[PDB]
Design an enzyme around this catalytic site. Structure first.
Site, PDB file in Angstrom:
ATOM      1  N   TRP A 196     -17.860  99.050  -0.585  1.00 20.08           N
ATOM      2  CA  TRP A 196     -18.944  99.549   0.254  1.00 20.08           C
ATOM      3  C   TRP A 196     -19.598 100.807  -0.321  1.00 20.08           C
ATOM      4  O   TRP A 196     -20.693 101.188   0.103  1.00 20.08           O
ATOM      5  CB  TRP A 196     -18.432  99.821   1.677  1.00 20.08           C
ATOM      6  CG  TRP A 196     -17.819  98.599   2.323  1.00 20.08           C
ATOM      7  CD1 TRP A 196     -16.487  98.357   2.527  1.00 20.08           C
ATOM      8  CD2 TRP A 196     -18.512  97.426   2.777  1.00 20.08           C
ATOM      9  NE1 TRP A 196     -16.308  97.103   3.074  1.00 20.08           N
ATOM     10  CE2 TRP A 196     -17.533  96.511   3.235  1.00 20.08           C
ATOM     11  CE3 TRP A 196     -19.863  97.059   2.837  1.00 20.08           C
ATOM     12  CZ2 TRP A 196     -17.864  95.249   3.751  1.00 20.08           C
ATOM     13  CZ3 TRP A 196     -20.195  95.795   3.355  1.00 20.08           C
ATOM     14  CH2 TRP A 196     -19.197  94.913   3.802  1.00 20.08           C
TER      15      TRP A 196
ATOM     16  N   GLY B 266     -23.913 101.118   7.605  1.00 20.85           N
ATOM     17  CA  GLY B 266     -23.216 102.257   7.047  1.00 20.85           C
ATOM     18  C   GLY B 266     -23.313 103.453   7.980  1.00 20.85           C
ATOM     19  O   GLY B 266     -23.320 104.604   7.542  1.00 20.85           O
ATOM     20  N   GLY B 267     -23.406 103.169   9.275  1.00 22.20           N
ATOM     21  CA  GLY B 267     -23.483 104.215  10.281  1.00 22.20           C
ATOM     22  C   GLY B 267     -24.636 105.195  10.147  1.00 22.20           C
ATOM     23  O   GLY B 267     -24.587 106.280  10.716  1.00 22.20           O
TER      24      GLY B 267
ATOM     25  N   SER C  25     -24.435  96.014  11.413  1.00 24.13           N
ATOM     26  CA  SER C  25     -23.984  97.297  11.911  1.00 24.13           C
ATOM     27  C   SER C  25     -25.153  98.218  12.178  1.00 24.13           C
ATOM     28  O   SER C  25     -26.044  97.905  12.957  1.00 24.13           O
ATOM     29  CB  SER C  25     -23.032  97.937  10.902  1.00 24.13           C
ATOM     30  OG  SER C  25     -22.128  98.807  11.554  1.00 24.13           O
TER      31      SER C  25
ATOM     32  N   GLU D 115     -13.831  93.304  15.170  1.00 23.12           N
ATOM     33  CA  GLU D 115     -14.710  94.421  14.828  1.00 23.12           C
ATOM     34  C   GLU D 115     -14.026  95.788  14.712  1.00 23.12           C
ATOM     35  O   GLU D 115     -14.351  96.578  13.828  1.00 23.12           O
ATOM     36  CB  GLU D 115     -15.819  94.545  15.876  1.00 23.12           C
ATOM     37  CG  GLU D 115     -16.777  93.365  15.942  1.00 23.12           C
ATOM     38  CD  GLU D 115     -17.713  93.303  14.751  1.00 23.12           C
ATOM     39  OE1 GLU D 115     -17.628  94.191  13.875  1.00 23.12           O
ATOM     40  OE2 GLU D 115     -18.537  92.368  14.699  1.00 23.12           O
TER      41      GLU D 115
ATOM     42  N   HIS E  71     -14.744  93.830  10.488  1.00 21.85           N
ATOM     43  CA  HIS E  71     -16.123  94.271  10.629  1.00 21.85           C
ATOM     44  C   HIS E  71     -16.784  94.239   9.248  1.00 21.85           C
ATOM     45  O   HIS E  71     -16.243  94.781   8.285  1.00 21.85           O
ATOM     46  CB  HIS E  71     -16.129  95.703  11.179  1.00 21.85           C
ATOM     47  CG  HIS E  71     -17.440  96.418  11.031  1.00 21.85           C
ATOM     48  ND1 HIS E  71     -18.509  96.213  11.879  1.00 21.85           N
ATOM     49  CD2 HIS E  71     -17.843  97.354  10.138  1.00 21.85           C
ATOM     50  CE1 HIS E  71     -19.511  96.996  11.520  1.00 21.85           C
ATOM     51  NE2 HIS E  71     -19.132  97.699  10.466  1.00 21.85           N
TER      52      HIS E  71
END
Ligand SMILES: *[C@@H]1O[C@H](CO[C@@H]2O[C@@H](C)[C@@H](O)[C@@H](O)[C@@H]2O)[C@@H](O[C@@H]2O[C@H](CO)[C@@H](O)[C@H](O)[C@H]2NC(C)=O)[C@H](O)[C@H]1NC(C)=O
Ligand SMILES: *[C@@H]1O[C@H](CO[C@@H]2O[C@@H](C)[C@@H](O)[C@@H](O)[C@@H]2O)[C@@H](O[C@@H]2O[C@H](CO)[C@@H](O)[C@H](O)[C@H]2NC(C)=O)[C@H](O)[C@H]1NC(C)=O
Ligand SMILES: *[C@@H]1O[C@H](CO)[C@@H](O)[C@H](O)[C@H]1NC(C)=O
Ligand SMILES: *[C@@H]1O[C@H](CO)[C@@H](O)[C@H](O)[C@H]1NC(C)=O
Ligand SMILES: [Cl-]
Length: 522
Positions: free
Chosen positions: A79, A113-114, A195, A321, A432
């Site tokens: 990621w 990625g928030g 997300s 999740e 998730h």
């Protein structure tokens, strides 16, 4: 292979995919680099260039902190940015079928990625497979994240907030004005993301300024009503100031920005973590805010009163999740053992995930999730479901229910297949973010996955493609389960897996009544 765009010519590269060919244009600029006096400001239109721009390699990823919790571990490192970090990161990618299409549907990916991390160059977001297999054009863009992309000072153009959302919008605009040249149909654009990317998609459904930039939307594991998706004006203000202090920039608010604009990206990134007194593993220090520009009112209000683009949506979540976040702070958890925790650890875990919640609020959570149906993993599983239900599943189901109540067709899926190549331990289950590789068709590449996974991926790719092209996620040729529309009453949804795909109803009924009706009161 040169394509003429509104701002100049761009050269791509040929790719061999499944005995065929895909033309890729990696790293096309779509906005003026947000550098110097432009840092923290909305993206500015790009200047027309001369010569041929070589879009033959992924561009720089935007500045961001990296996950350093498991050095050398593919589960987490997959990621992290796989391209140089830089403030000069406003670029996008285009994958078109070969031979060149004449009026293909366009899929635009928005990574998650928030809102703090992410980049479109990750291996799991490679759109060459979709272009090859479904003959659609795939576009993805890099947008500013963290403080550089969401630092908020409402009303102040120096740092109005939502800059990252506006970067995305400017990218959507680029497609509108240029995709036709690549053989794409600007009238058939479907946005999809996961997300924070899904939450972004949901916000574009609410932003009047994005209304005419796309046709349909796909939301994977995310929506703006998720508790981590929107930063309150109160928190934003307190975070902007805490950042100012940590960098010796406390001052006139405009002078604060001028000060922060002299700071090096590393100093800004270094202090983003401490802006919050007690953050959680989700950690959205700087996210979307009601700026009065992109978002004209509290999203929850716009959703409740039917103020959003009317169209079809495809929404879904993964079976587990929450697990992924348990190893980033929850006591007794580890990716290297079965993580069998105790009631005491579970209670401490809630502490970690619900920092500012009253003691009664946490007990209400424990009460709802501990009426055991003994089993040593009761608490381990309960905490995961708690995190997952609260942060993703229930918000997604509520968004879908509310959105469909205004007359549009909606389709909901429950992804429950655990990749055979998952690097994380089994107790984490269907994690998730791990439906993405299936959506992008990586399992179609036999060089890698079981035969069952190739079939499941091929099916998902077809459903996603049919949804983008015709607003209906059906697989009409191989006697496949028909995907029913999701309605407020029956609430039917489709399960995706290798075994047998089924039509179920009212996912997490009891759990969501808790999170959607009760908890918001504590
Ligand atoms: C708003 O921020 C204040 C200040 O946060 C502190 O200073 C920042 C620059 C950063 O270094 C933070 O880590 C600091 O916490 C918050 O007030 C703090 O509250 C904690 C409670 O545990 C306390 O220990 C600190 O001493 C307080 N900071 C000081 C010195 O005043 C406050 O909680 C934030 N408001 C919100 C959103 O709740
Ligand atoms: C699973 O591991 C956790 C984490 O412990 C670390 O990682 C292990 C794989 C091993 O390398 C340990 O030496 C590391 O410390 C264990 O949780 C720890 O448990 C001890 C005693 O119960 C406690 O003092 C620590 O604070 C815990 N660490 C954390 C971060 O909570 C856990 O006990 C292991 N589960 C099993 C197999 O029982
Ligand atoms: C783009 O590619 C051409 C030929 O491949 C090359 O001549 C040119 O220098 C390149 N442009 C650059 C490196 O800016
Ligand atoms: C693409 O399709 C649209 C309708 O969806 C049509 O209006 C447009 O003219 C087509 N583009 C081409 C091939 O000219
Ligand atoms: Cl089937």
């Amino acid at each position: 292979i040169i394509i003429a765009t509104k701002n100049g010519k761009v050269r791509g590269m040929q790719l061999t995919v499944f005995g065929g060919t895909v033309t890729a244009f990696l790293g096309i600029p779509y906005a003026q680099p947000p550098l110097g006096r432009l840092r923290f400001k909305k993206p500015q239109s790009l200047t027309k260039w001369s010569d041929i721009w070589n879009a033959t390699k992924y561009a720089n990823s935007c500045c961001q902190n990296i996950d350093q919790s498991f050095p050398g571990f593919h589960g987490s490192e997959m990621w992290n940015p796989n391209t140089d970090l830089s403030e000069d990161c406003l670029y996008l990618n285009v994958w078109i079928p070969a031979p060149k299409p004449k009026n293909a549907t366009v899929l635009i990916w928005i990574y998650g990625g928030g809102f703090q991390t992410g980049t479109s160059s990750l291996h799991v977001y490679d759109g060459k497979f979709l272009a090859r297999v479904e003959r659609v054009i795939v576009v993805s863009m890099n947008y500013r994240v963290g403080a550089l992309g969401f630092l908020a000072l409402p009303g102040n153009p120096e740092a109005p907030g939502n800059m990252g959302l506006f970067d995305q919008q400017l990218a959507l605009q680029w497609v509108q004005k240029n995709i036709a040249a690549f053989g794409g149909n600007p009238k058939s654009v479907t946005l999809f993301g996961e997300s924070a990317g899904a939450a972004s998609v949901s916000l574009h459904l609410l932003s009047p300024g994005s209304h005419s930039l796309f046709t349909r939307a796909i939301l994977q594991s995310g929506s703006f009503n998720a508790p981590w998706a929107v930063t309150s004006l109160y928190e934003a203000r307190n975070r902007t100031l805490n950042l100012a202090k940590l960098t010796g920039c406390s001052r006139n608010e405009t002078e604060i920005i001028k000060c922060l604009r002299n700071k090096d990206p590393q100093e800004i990134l270094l202090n983003e973590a401490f802006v919050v007194p007690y953050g959680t593993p989700l950690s959205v220090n700087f996210g979307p805010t009601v700026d009065g520009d992109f978002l004209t009112d509290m999203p929850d209000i716009l959703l409740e009163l039917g103020q959003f683009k009317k169209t079809q949506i495809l929404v879904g979540v993964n079976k587990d999740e929450g697990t992924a976040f348990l190893v980033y702070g929850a006591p007794g958890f580890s990716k290297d053992n079965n993580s069998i925790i105790t009631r005491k650890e579970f209670q401490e875990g809630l502490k970690i995930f619900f920092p500012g919640v009253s003691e009664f609020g946490k007990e209400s959570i424990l009460f709802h999730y501990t009426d055991w149906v003994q089993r040593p993993e009761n608490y381990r599983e309960a905490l995961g479901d708690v995190v997952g239900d609260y942060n993703f599943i229930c918000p997604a189901l509520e968004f879908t229910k509310k959105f469909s109540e205004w007359g549009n067709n909606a389709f909901f899926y429950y992804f429950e297949h655990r990749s055979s190549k998952l690097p994380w331990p089994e107790w984490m289950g269907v994690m998730h973010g791990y439906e993405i590789e299936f959506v992008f068709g990586l399992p179609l590449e036999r060089r890698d996955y079981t035969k069952a996974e190739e079939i499941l991926s091929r099916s998902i790719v077809k459903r996603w493609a049919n949804f983008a092209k015709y607003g209906n996620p059906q697989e009409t040729q191989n006697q496949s389960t028909s995907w029913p529309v999701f309605k407020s009453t029956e609430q039917k949804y489709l399960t995706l897996n290798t075994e047998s795909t089924r039509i179920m109803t009212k996912l997490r009924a009891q759990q969501c009544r808790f999170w959607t009706s009760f908890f918001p009161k504590v």
